[PDB]
Structures are given as C-alpha cells and as structure tokens.
Design a protein around this ligand. Sequence first.
Ligand SMILES: CCCCCCCCCCCCCC(=O)CSCCNC(=O)CCNC(=O)[C@H](O)C(C)(C)COP(=O)(O)OP(=O)(O)OC[C@H]1O[C@@H](n2cnc3c(N)ncnc32)[C@H](O)[C@@H]1OP(=O)(O)O
Ligand SMILES: COc1cccc(COC(=O)c2oc3cccc(OC4CCNCC4)c3c2C)c1
Ligand SMILES: [Cl-]
Ligand SMILES: [Mg+2]
Length: 385
Amino acid sequence: MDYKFWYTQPVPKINDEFNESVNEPFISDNKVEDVRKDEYKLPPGYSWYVCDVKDEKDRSEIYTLLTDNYVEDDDNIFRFNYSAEFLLWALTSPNYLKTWHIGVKYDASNKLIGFISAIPTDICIHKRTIKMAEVNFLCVHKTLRSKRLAPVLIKEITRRINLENIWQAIYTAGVYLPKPVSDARYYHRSINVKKLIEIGFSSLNSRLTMSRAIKLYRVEDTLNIKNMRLMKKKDVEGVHKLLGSYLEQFNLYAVFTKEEIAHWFLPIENVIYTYVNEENGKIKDMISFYSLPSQILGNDKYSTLNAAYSFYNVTTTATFKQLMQDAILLAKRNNFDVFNALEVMQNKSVFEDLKFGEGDGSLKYYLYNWKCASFAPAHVGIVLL
Ligand SMILES: CCCCCCCCCCCCCC(=O)CSCCNC(=O)CCNC(=O)[C@H](O)C(C)(C)COP(=O)(O)OP(=O)(O)OC[C@H]1O[C@@H](n2cnc3c(N)ncnc32)[C@H](O)[C@@H]1OP(=O)(O)O
Ligand SMILES: COc1cccc(COC(=O)c2oc3cccc(OC4CCNCC4)c3c2C)c1
Ligand SMILES: [Cl-]
Ligand SMILES: [Mg+2]
C-alpha cells in the first residue's frame, strides 16, 4: 500500500533486498542520553497507564481488552483468546521490565482501550547475538480503529526500549508490512474432527463423510517414546543443553539462559506443556506446546476452540515424525481440539504424513532496526506467542 508510518522507521523499504553478507543495524551508534524522556502525545482524553501484570486486576483488564479486541481470522468467525494466566507467563519472563507493559486508558470511563508490550530476549540473527525486545499483544479497541493510535503505541514502546539501550526488536504479524525477514505458513492438525467441522474450522467433501473424517484423524493412544513425561525443575540443565545445541543451526533464534529455560518450559496447566525423555539422567528428547484458545464468534453450541500451538520440539532418539506424532498425542491427552504449527525449523517435513492441513494465511517475521538477507522459514528457529 503506502506505509506512511513505516516508511519513517528504521526498517527496509518494500523493494529492499539484501545480500546474505549484510547483517547490521539500519542506525548504529545510538545514544541513551539522546532519547526522548517525554511520553508520546495521545489524543485529547486519553492517558498512558503502567500495567502491573502481577496485579490480578490490571492483568484482568488487559485480558478483557484482548478478549474483545484482539486478532481474528480472515472471516471474523474466531478471535484469539489468550488467558490471563497465559498473559502472566508471557509478560513476566526473566528480567522483564514493568514499564514495557504499556496501557492507554480513556479518561472519562477509566477503561483500558489500548495495549502494547515487550520483553527482553537475546536474539541470534545470522550468527550475531543482539539484545532485543520481543513485541507482542499490540491491541487497540475496535471502536477506535484507523485513528492512527497504533503508531503512538509503537513509538512510545520504542522510546521505552531505547531508554534501556536496546535498539532492535523482533515481532510477528499476519499482515504484510515493511518488510518480512521470513514468512511462515501455518498448518492445523485436527484432533476433535466433528467439533472442528461443526464450528466451520474444517470441512467435509463427498469423498469424506463424517465417519471417514473421524477415522482419518484417529490416533493410537500409545507414545512412540514411551518415557515422555512432564518436565520438572530437575530437567532445566538438560533441556537448556538439548534445546540450546539444536537451535544453533538456524538463522534466527533466541539464546536462552537456564533461567529462561525454566520460565519458558516448566509446565503450567492450560498455558505451557513440556515433555522430556530422560535416559541415564540426560534429557534426550523434548516436546512443547502452548495453549491458545480461540473464541468462537456466534456458534450456538461452542464458545471456545481448545487449541495447542507447537513450541519447541527436539529428538535425538526417534525420527522427527515420531516426535511430532507423540506431540499430537500429548495434545490430545490434554483435551485440545487441534494442534497448530508453523513451517519453521523441521516442521514442514512432517505435515503431510501427520495429516496437517494447510491454513489460510501466513505469519510474517520482522526485525526493527536490522538489515539482513531474508530467508525461507525452515531457517527460522524462534516461535513467538
Ligand atoms: C528497538 C525497539 C523497537 C520497538 C518497536 C518495534 C516495532 C513493533 C511493531 C508492532 C508489532 C506488533 C506485534 C503484535 O502484537 C502481533 S501482531 C497482532 C496485532 N494485533 C492485532 O492484529 C489485533 C487487532 N487489531 C488491532 O488492535 C489494530 O488493528 C492494531 C492495533 C493492530 C492497528 O491499529 P489500527 O487502528 O488498525 O491502525 P492505526 O492505529 O490507524 O495505525 C495504522 C498504522 O499501524 C500499522 N499497523 C497495523 N497493524 C500493525 C501490526 N500488527 N504491526 C505493526 N504495525 C501495524 C499500519 O500498517 C499503519 O502504518 P502504515 O501507515 O505505515 O502502514
Ligand atoms: C482459529 O482461530 C483464529 C483466530 C485468529 C486468527 C486466526 C488465523 O490465524 C491462524 O490460524 C494461525 O495459526 C497459527 C499456527 C501457529 C502459529 C500462529 O501464529 C503465532 C501464534 C499466535 N499469535 C501470533 C504468532 C498461528 C496463527 C496466527 C485463527
Ligand atoms: Cl513523532
Ligand atoms: Mg487507531
């Protein structure tokens, strides 16, 4: 389109394409002492608000904002419905800053109508490891859309991040903006087939009757890796090493510390599931997925789609296909209707054999203030939430 906000930002032009050997900021040499110390102006009757995610009430108000106003599917039949407990997990990682959790309230009602967040994470992009901010959960109330509020939120978080002497960020969106480093399609592996058909997430063709669709997706309730168990505190060193060593091969991935591994993977009911296979006290395989339910808009029978999203999966003792079959099965065991993944890492390789369907769109990966060659998604080794 025209991208009049994005064009003033340190990000590539729509027509920019860089050699593999390019790996550097757009703007280097930045200075904390020069960063604006004043908050971005909001329109009359609107105020900044510092959200304390560890306060139940503040967390609940972010949760209602996103519940009613967050990302929908193209046909406006489903809306992402991140739980409050998920938000807590997502936003309170190691060394997080409360003042990168940014709310906008409407003066007169005192109601939260806008939100944007970031967490600090070490990102390796093309073998350069950079302190970055991972930005998520940008949201403006449906009644206030197209008012140019989203650039005010962006600019204000950029200012807040810059104050910490961080100059790059990482983010994903479904919408095309200037300009993806990678673009990954999503795929859906049906578990509760009939519910999926009923709510219009999946469809039948005459070759596929209801009974046939149900047989097609039926799994065996027996793991390929018999000893796969919920991760415990004792497993953090092992997971750190297994995941840490695996991720080195990709062009884009998070460099997790131990403290990060514990946060990111220790299980929490209805938010994050990690399973491990220990052999001789060494952690040899792992599976992880997170819970992201979709609210079903206007379906008489169901109000929630229970969905599991693939997180980080590593196998040394089985085929990746066997690993990801077990991950489908562990998801089913925890009541999920569907197992979603992106075509990142080695995922695409198993999608056909494990009966994933292609979805309807793709997820773009972005860096802010970084110049580098774009790449196919199989070179992406990071999953954002
Ligand atoms: C070094 C530190 C750096 C930190 C900062 C890093 C950057 C982080 C960037 C944030 C990454 C967030 C990642 C994330 O959370 C994950 S992606 C999901 C974002 N949330 C949703 O899609 C929920 C529903 N929609 C809304 O809330 C509104 O439509 C939002 C708020 C999306 C835009 O509100 P609006 O009422 O529809 O629009 P205006 O206010 O009038 O603004 C229009 C301007 O916003 C640009 N826009 C629209 N959607 C965008 C998006 N998803 N990313 C970036 N930019 C987006 C748009 O292109 C236009 O700029 P342009 O004229 O150049 O084209
Ligand atoms: C059925 O429910 C919905 C609700 C809203 C939108 C859509 C359409 O996008 C997908 O159906 C969709 O499927 C995916 C599978 C893996 C990872 C994905 O993106 C991540 C995780 C979610 N937040 C941002 C980064 C996705 C998405 C966005 C489907
Ligand atoms: Cl400005
Ligand atoms: Mg707006």
